[PDB]
């Protein structure tokens, strides 16, 4: 079974969501982020010393 959700980007924060399939008991997931990097791309142009 497939599902979609959104989570807020802030370190150390709880968020939780469902599935409610049919027949079966419900199920609750929680998602929590611990780290978030970021990285640009570079190309050198000159130096100095």
């Amino acid at each position: 079974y497939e599902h979609t959700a959104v989570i807020p980007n802030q370190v150390g924060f709880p968020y939780k969501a469902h599935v409610a399939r049919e027949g079966y008991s419900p199920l609750t997931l929680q998602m929590q982020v611990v780290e978030t990097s970021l990285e640009p791309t570079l190309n050198l142009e000159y130096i100095t010393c």
Binding site: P14, K16, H18, Y24, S25, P26, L27, T28
Partner: protein, 49 residues
């Protein structure tokens, strides 16, 4: 098969603050028929469990 049946649920409250952490407590009352483990959720965006 190991899903317990729970009915006549009634919720009250005793204490709250705003504040910045888990400062609201509530009890629950329900008649059981079988032991096990159920799952909990509050379906609105104003208070997270």
């Amino acid at each position: 098969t190991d899903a317990p049946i729970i009915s006549e649920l009634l919720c009250t409250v005793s204490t709250c603050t705003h504040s910045s952490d888990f400062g609201g407590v509530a009890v629950l009352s329900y008649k059981v028929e079988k032991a096990g483990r159920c799952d909990v959720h509050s379906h609105s965006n104003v208070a997270v469990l």
